[PDB]
Write a protein that binds this ligand. Structure first.
Ligand SMILES: CCCCCCCCCCCCCCCCCC(=O)O[C@H](COC(=O)CCCCCC)COP(=O)(O)OCCN
Ligand SMILES: CC(C)CCC[C@@H](C)[C@H]1CC[C@H]2[C@@H]3CC=C4C[C@@H](OC(=O)CCC(=O)O)CC[C@]4(C)[C@H]3CC[C@]12C
Ligand SMILES: FC(F)(F)c1ccccc1-c1cc(C(F)(F)F)c2[nH]c(C3=NOC4(CCCCC4)C3)nc2c1
Ligand SMILES: CCCCCCCCCCC
Ligand SMILES: CCCCCCCCCCC
Ligand code: NA
Ligand code: NA
Lengths: 857, 93, 44
């Protein structure tokens, strides 16, 4: 059909190959089958509540793969049911909406792509077919429908998730004789369950009953119906409601009090559970009721009615029930199976994990791994992309599952498996490092936008766990920082927080105190600053009772990074005073013995820095001031070979290279003074302003070159020696050209002035205690890594080179996990549980008012 | 807390031999049939919390179970319940 | 015992020096004594 399939049928059709028509020449079979009953009511109060209930129903029908049996006409609900079906195929979350019509009640007919005319819906009582139903089969209709549902309820499937039985549910709302008749043929012919609602005429007369008091409530909800149909038909209606309350287990109500989601999936699953439970051929079966309550998300029904200690499972049979709890993303059920006993390390064999990374790893996330591994590479990503490829080509098993959940952005499933890991403040940072690598991938903003926040949730979990760890024992938490992880990724929690730029983990007072312990070395804090400095100039004051080291005292003093840095600054000044004494009073013609001292004092400055050409990765060359140090030392060695040339034009030029080298050796000392003073909140203002003036001095040099072309082009390989140098030395005819020449200077200034003022203020635009404390931790960490031994005795170390904490961290996790849930009492402060806790207390008053009218009548 | 004949027997030997006190909880089978009582209405609440237990043990043993709960309510002062309404700390202490 | 102490006993043991075993050759006495009852329930 074209406004879709069509089949003409009379009522006495065939023997069940109508279903085999639907599955052999046609679409797939069913794990679920909802039917809808509203009749040909042209009026339908389409409330936004009714819009949610019948949009969740189509969403559930594609979440399970169901058919929907409706009258296939273009009126009200069954028109709206079709529109949510085409809304679902457009949104692409398929769903099959099979329409059941009379063939005698339709408007037009075309017999053979057939064309149908949706002309207009006037006063003619014939019905208009609906345009959005995927299949159409054509109160004539209410036997071929009811025999089909009485077939497929008995159709035994070999898959058999719901005792075989192809789960049927009858979704009912609204009034009319036809919807009250169809609930009867639902319950009484065979027994599929029925779901009713809290709005409608016939829907509320059965919702009120969960006698002639039937008819009392019946004229409450539909009084203008009784005035037309007969009293020999009013007697049948009270009779009809009597055969639906004979089976009160096959009825679930959607009460108006449920003002939220879950409510359509709660009602269908509860109705499917009773029709599984009250069958009683299944009450001994705890396992079929588990997979039924796990395919749906009924956590509370599984906790109350399957794990009771009246049923006796023994938790070793719970293996395949756990695997489907993982791959369907049921985070409440993987938590329920561990709470009721499951050794998750025993369950996670290596072929289960390769069953998880092959079949259950999504190809979109695996596509974003290649855009992460090849474009934004790290030491962790090369480990994890290797670890994914080992499983896909077919030992810490709890972290292979944890990486699997974190990669797929499974937000609540990964937090269940994180509480089972052993190194769990390290798995939280290892997830935060991994997710921040996936958040760099700009192939999808929605995937990267949720891996970015899942990284911030796991950074906050590592903060709150380590704050719990540091508050209990400092010396144990600092062993937990530097734990070498047995190849988690081959990193500490401290390394893995600084690659990820995890500023909240690094700015916390436990980590910042660990670095101050590292920088002071074996010298304690609280001594004083000047108390350590005066022990530098005075050796026997160390052995005196003067510092607090918490001989072996002298080696602990002179290997602390505070002392080594203070020595390397004091020796650098004494190097500069010797470099100034040689350059002025000495330096006659030959390399004097005091200058030979300077030749080895820069060689130990050179070997210290090609040592920093290890731990290198060409990170060192993007530091913008550390490249000055090589080019100060390379300019020194170039000034040595000009000294050993015996020409007075070259010897003097060898001195000039040394005198210009004295400034960059002092500019390094000025740079050391300006960073060590502004270590503190100004280190963000510094080094961002410092790259901002390098851009302004670059643009000033570009303008100074262009000023040279305008200078030399106005006047008369010589050009490079005159277009570059003389504009700086000049800062050391009028045709009418001053009409633009001051407008040159009014445009030269206001592009160099603005670039200067951007440099002063550009640090402000674009948390600033955490932004600082990461960088203060960053800079101090490299010097504590920079060979904490005195500088002239660095060569004597350079050429001489040529799990009970995890048990302790596990008990700190349990104290941390309690402190989350006991703080979620302001969430339980609300009237959620508090509302009908006392309506239970007046139902007890109702339960004792049962006793009163029992004997007064 | 929890159910079974052995935990219901041990509350008896707790209270009736000499008299040390007993603390019960608000989750379990035998724990809640004594938490509900703070006759055959004993057995009415008993199949509320443990119905699949009565189907195995004898009626000459079901009579002892209603008898056993009768010797713990003779001393109602040696019974403290941890009701589920106490959703916080302090509750064990 | 190594996976802790162990003592084998039948049910008719002695006259109260089992407690004096626990306090003279063994650990300290008690300002409190909780007992727990759940039985051998493998499910919890
Ligand atoms: C040619 C070479 C000429 C050499 C001139 C000698 C320079 C004198 C020494 C000054 C070092 C730079 C100071 C940087 C700084 O402020 O760090 C200061 C130390 O300042 C002082 O020592 C105060 C008096 C110094 C007296 C020196 C004899 C670090 O102090 P503080 O840790 O409290 O700073 C908090 C945030 N970082
Ligand atoms: C006349 C000359 C030859 C003698 C003057 C001695 C100073 C040049 C020396 C001795 C004390 C030194 C200072 C000792 C303590 C300060 C603060 C200190 O602060 C920190 O540790 C940074 C805080 C942090 O890392 O978290 C860093 C070294 C510094 C700048 C040192 C810089 C150079 C100083 C001033
Ligand atoms: F001081 C400083 F920045 F506040 C600082 C403060 C706190 C901790 C460490 C440092 C620091 C940082 C660096 C840098 F980050 F820049 F690498 C340093 N570099 C040197 C040099 N000593 O010899 C050299 C100078 C002469 C030429 C060869 C190399 C380099 N000392 C440093 C101390
Ligand atoms: C921040 C304390 C700085 C104190 C400097 C003391 C200098 C001592 C010089 C001894 C010759
Ligand atoms: C050609 C001179 C135009 C006026 C220069 C005033 C600029 C002042 C800059 C102060 C930072
Ligand atoms: Na200018
Ligand atoms: Na300027």
């Amino acid at each position: 059909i074209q406004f879709g399939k069509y089949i003409r049928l009379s009522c006495d059709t065939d023997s069940e190959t109508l279903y085999d028509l639907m599955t052999q020449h046609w679409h797939l079979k069913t794990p679920n089958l909802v039917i809808s009953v509203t009749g040909g009511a042209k009026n339908f109060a389409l409330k936004p509540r009714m819009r949610k209930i019948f949009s969740r129903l189509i969403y559930i029908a594609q979440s399970k793969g169901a058919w929907i049996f409706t009258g296939g006409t273009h009126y009200g609900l069954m028109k709206y049911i079709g529109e949510v079906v085409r809304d679902n195929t457009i949104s692409r979350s398929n769903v099959v909406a099979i329409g059941i019509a009379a063939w005698g009640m339709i408007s037009n007919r075309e017999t053979l792509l057939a064309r149908y005319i949706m002309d207009d819906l006037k006063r003619d009582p014939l019905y208009c077919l609906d345009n959005n139903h995927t299949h159409l089969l054509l109160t004539t209709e209410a036997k071929v429908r009811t025999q089909l549902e009485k077939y497929i309820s008995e159709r035994v499937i070999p898959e058999s998730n719901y005792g075989g039985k192809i789960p049927i549910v009858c979704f009912a709302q609204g009034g009319g004789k036809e919807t009250l008749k169809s609930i009867n043929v639902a319950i009484k012919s065979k027994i599929p369950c029925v779901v009713v609602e809290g709005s409608g005429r016939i829907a509320d007369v059965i919702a009120s009953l969960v006698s002639s008091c039937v008819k009392e409530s019946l004229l409450r909800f539909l009084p203008r119906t009784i005035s037309r149909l007969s009293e020999e038909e009013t007697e049948s209606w009270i009779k009809w409601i009597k055969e639906v309350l004979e089976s009160p287990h096959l009825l679930t109500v959607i009460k108006i009090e449920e003002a939220g989601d879950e409510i359509v999936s709660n009602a269908i699953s509860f109705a499917l559970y009773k029709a599984f439970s009250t069958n009683e051929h299944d009450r001994d079966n705890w396992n079929g009721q588990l997979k039924l309550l796990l395919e749906w998300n009924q956590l509370d029904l599984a906790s109350d009615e399957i794990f009771t200690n009246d049923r006796n499972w023994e938790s070793a049979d719970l293996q395949d029930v756990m695997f489907t709890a993982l791959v369907k993303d049921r985070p409440k059920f993987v938590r329920l199976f561990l709470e009721n006993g499951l050794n998750l390390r025993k369950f996670l064999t290596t072929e289960v994990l390769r069953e998880l990374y092959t079949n259950n790893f999504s190809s979109l996330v695996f596509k974003n791994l290649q855009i992460a591994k090849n474009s934004y590479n790290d030491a962790l990503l090369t480990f994890v992309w290797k670890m994914v490829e080992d499983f896909r080509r077919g030992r810490h098993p709890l972290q292979a599952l944890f990486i699997w959940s974190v990669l797929q952005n499974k937000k609540e499933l990964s937090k269940v498996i994180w509480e089972q890991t052993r190194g769990c403040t390290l798995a939280a940072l290892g997830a935060s490092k991994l997710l921040k690598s996936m958040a760099k991938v700009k192939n999808d903003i929605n995937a990267a936008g949720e891996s970015e926040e899942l990284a911030n949730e796991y950074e906050t979990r590592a903060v709150e766990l380590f704050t719990e760890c540091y508050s209990n024992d400092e010396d144990l938490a600092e062993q937990l920082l530097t734990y070498s992880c047995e190849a988690w990724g081959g990193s500490n929690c401290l390394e893995l927080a600084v690659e990820a730029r995890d500023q909240q983990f690094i700015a916390q007072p436990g980590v910042q105190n660990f670095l101050s312990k590292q920088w002071y070395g074996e010298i304690s804090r609280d001594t004083k600053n000047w108390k350590i400095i005066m022990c530098l100039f005075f050796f026997p004051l160390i052995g005196c009772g003067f510092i607090s080291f918490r001989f072996l005292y002298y080696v602990s003093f002179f290997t602390s990074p505070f002392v080594v840095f203070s020595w390397n600054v004091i020796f650098y000044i004494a190097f500069l005073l010797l470099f100034a004494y040689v350059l002025l009073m000495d330096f006659q013609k030959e390399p004097t013995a005091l200058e030979i001292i300077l030749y080895v004092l820069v060689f130990v400055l050179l070997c210290d820095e090609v040592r920093q050409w290890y731990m290198n990765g060409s990170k060192y060359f993007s530091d913008l001031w550390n490249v000055m140090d090589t080019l100060a030392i390379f300019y020194f060695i170039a000034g040595i070979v000009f000294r050993l040339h015996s020409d007075e034009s070259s010897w003097y030029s060898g001195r000039v290279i040394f005198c210009l080298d004295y400034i960059v050796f002092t500019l390094r000392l000025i740079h050391i003074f300006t960073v060590s003073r502004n270590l503190g909140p100004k280190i963000i203002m510094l080094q961002r302003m410092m790259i901002d003036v390098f851009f302004f001095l670059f643009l000033f040099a570009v303008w100074m070159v262009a000023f040279g072309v305008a200078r030399q082009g106005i006047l008369r390989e010589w050009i490079f020696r005159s277009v570059i140098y003389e504009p700086y030395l000049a800062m050391f005819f009028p045709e009418w050209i001053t009409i633009p020449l001051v407008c040159i200077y009014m445009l030269s200034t206001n592009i160099l002035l603005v670039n200067l003022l951007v440099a002063m203020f550009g640090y402000t635009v674009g948390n600033n205690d955490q932004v600082w404390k990461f960088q203060r931790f960053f800079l101090v960490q490299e010097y504590c890594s920079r060979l904490t031994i005195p500088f002239p005795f660095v060569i004597f170390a350079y050429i001489f080179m040529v799990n009970e904490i995890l048990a302790w961290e596990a008990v700190m996790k349990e104290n941390y996990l309690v402190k989350i849930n006991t703080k979620a009492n302001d969430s339980s402060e609300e009237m959620v549980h508090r509302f009908r806790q006392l309506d239970a207390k007046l139902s007890d008053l109702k339960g004792l008012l049962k006793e009163i009218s029992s004997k007064i009548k």
